[PDB]
Homo-oligomer: A and B are copies of this chain.
Amino acid sequence: MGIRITGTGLFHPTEIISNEELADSLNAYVEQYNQENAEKIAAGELEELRGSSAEFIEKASGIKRRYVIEKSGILDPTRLRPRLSERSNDELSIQAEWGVIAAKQAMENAGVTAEDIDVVILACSNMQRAYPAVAIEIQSALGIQGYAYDMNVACSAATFGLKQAADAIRSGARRVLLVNVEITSGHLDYRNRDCHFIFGDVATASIIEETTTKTGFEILDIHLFTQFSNNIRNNFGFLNRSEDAVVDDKLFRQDGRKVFKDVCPLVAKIINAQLEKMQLTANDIKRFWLHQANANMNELILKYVAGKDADLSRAPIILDEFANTSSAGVIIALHRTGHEVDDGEYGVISSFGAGYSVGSIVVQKHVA
């Protein structure tokens, strides 16, 4: 009791890549590859590459576009990664800069200032460097005094981060700033038709406070769950240098079919057990804020936990515009539609994905 999400913030870069631009770009790479390797095709030595299309992407996921940090290099079929420049230690890192922008909006929405915050958690799927923690970089750019740390549970990092925020509040923290900064274009493989469309870039932030007198979503129950799986994995890391690594697996890899099979029943089972635990039915939940990877997966999970005739409207979809933003997804959804929940009504925040990880939070809105 007494712990509320009182504000959220959102930043996305300016440039947009539509499905068609992305498909056009990969088609060119696949075409050139299949020419250059034609004799290797006819020989069965190397595997031929298959193009993609806007319809195949949208039908597979519900994604239509995504925001990206830098558009040219991603679409450039001879580059297939954003065109970025190294920054000097004296300027904000990219990740710290995005985090600060999202975080200032969360703070302004919650009506708090730097001196009001005690903890800064950077919770996301990939940190730009190991030390000093980018969370501490964000913390000091904002002028916040307390402590900060980086934390990684991939797609579920925001719901784990909310639990850790609530845990620190129970122990004495007044207010926690939770920040998720996902520059997925830095570790996505744009050569692969099966994953090149999945992810977008974004930063989100949340202010979590101990309060009974500010409007916000009070956290009622948290279920976190992990179970190791290699069905989503990125083997890039600081030991690749010492391994003299050669395997081409240093970016996002996924068996999408197995993830879909494994995670849908996992999420629904966790949500249902949580609702039972809380003496609530699915029809007491005004909004399900679900992970934003795949609208079919969401509709599936939604129709199990709720009725088959539940209104589309109760599980907001933002992935059409952002693609999958990994840990940031549920926060985007909450940021865009929390206003659709009435005073006293209930909501569910649930992330799921890599690691296998699942986090599920029951909340109830209070208006001050």
Contacts and interface: CB of A to CB of B under 8 A. Distances in A.
Contacts of A115: none
Contacts of A128: 237-239
A150 B152 contact: yes
Contacts of A275: none
A151 B137 CA distance: 16
Interface string A131-153: 11101110111000111111111
Count class of interface residues, chain A: 35 or more
Nearest to A151: B151
A86 B243 contact: yes
A168 B166 CA distance: 10
A246 interface: yes
A234 interface: yes
Q: How many copies does the complex hold?
A: 2
Contact of A242 (B84, B224, B238, B355): B84
Contact of A226 (B86, B94, B139, B224): B139
Contacts of A359: 147
Given A131-B152, A150-B152, A355-B133, A140 B228 contact: yes
A245 B356 CA distance: 32
A361 B40 CA distance: 62
A207 B225 CA distance: 20
A149 B152 contact: yes
B160 A166 contact: no
A232 B133 CA distance: 11
Closest 10 CB pairs of A and B: A140-B228, A167-B167, A147-B224, A131-B154, A132-B355, A131-B354, A150-B152, A84-B242, A129-B237, A89-B230
